[PDB]
Amino acid sequence: GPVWRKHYITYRINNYTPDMNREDVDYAIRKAFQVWSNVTPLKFSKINTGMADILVVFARGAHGDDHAFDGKGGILAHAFGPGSGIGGDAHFDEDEFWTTHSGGTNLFLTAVHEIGHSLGLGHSSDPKAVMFPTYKYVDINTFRLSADDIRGIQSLYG
Numbered sequence: 001g002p003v004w005r006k007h008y009i010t011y012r013i014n015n016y017t018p019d020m021n022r023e024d025v026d027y028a029i030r031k032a033f034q035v036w037s038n039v040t041p042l043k044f045s046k047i048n049t050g051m052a053d054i055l056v057v058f059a060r061g062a063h064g065d066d067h068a069f070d071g072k073g074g075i076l077a078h079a080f081g082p083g084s085g086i087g088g089d090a091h092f093d094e095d096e097f098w099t100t101h102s103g104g105t106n107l108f109l110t111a112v113h114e115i116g117h118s119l120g121l122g123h124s125s126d127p128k129a130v131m132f133p134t135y136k137y138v139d140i141n142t143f144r145l146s147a148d149d150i151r152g153i154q155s156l157y158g
């Protein structure tokens with residue numbers, strides 16, 4: 001499927017979850033992009049205005065695409081594969097409780113997964129992989145991509 005055909009990728013944070021400190025939202029998203037730029041030729045920059053490649057949105061229920069959210073639990077987030085317009089965009093369910101830690105749903109960990117989709121990755125059948133469909137908390141301070149995630153992303157880039 002689709003991949004970004006350029007090395008400098010931009011992201012924009014459309015709006016901020018009230019569940020977290022603003023600076024923590026910013027850092028969790030930055031860190032999540034870094035996971036992917038660590039293992040590809042990609043470079044990601046936050047822009048504050050105008051059109052980004054990847055728009056990060058928090059929203060609940062019906063929010064203007066074809067992927068209605070479902071309240072607390074169930075689908076936590078979803079994102080669009082590379083492409084123009086909504087392509088690349090990552091949407092986080094406001095009905096989750098977003099956090100920096102193991103409480104609620106960890107924003108960083110979810111963002112690593114969603115950004116994987118934003119870059120062109122589908123789900124992994126390997127429970128060890130970040131791209132495995134089921135959310136399971138792992139220590140964010142020592143987080144590492146599975147071998148499965150690395151071969152997947154490296155099949156698309158670099």
Ligand SMILES: COc1ccc(S(N)(=O)=O)cc1
Pocket residue numbers: 074075076077078109110111113114130132133134135136
């Ligand atoms: C690790 O990150 C995630 C993010 C989302 C989901 S899901 N498919 O909405 O339950 C699973 C894992």
Ligand SMILES: [Ca+2]
Pocket residue numbers: 069070071072073074075076077093095096
């Ligand atoms: Ca949900």
Ligand SMILES: [Ca+2]
Pocket residue numbers: 052053054055083084085086087088089
């Ligand atoms: Ca986009």
Ligand SMILES: [Ca+2]
Pocket residue numbers: 017018019093094095096097098
């Ligand atoms: Ca919330």
Ligand SMILES: [Zn+2]
Pocket residue numbers: 063065067078091
């Ligand atoms: Zn959406």
Ligand SMILES: [Zn+2]
Pocket residue numbers: 113117123133
């Ligand atoms: Zn997914």
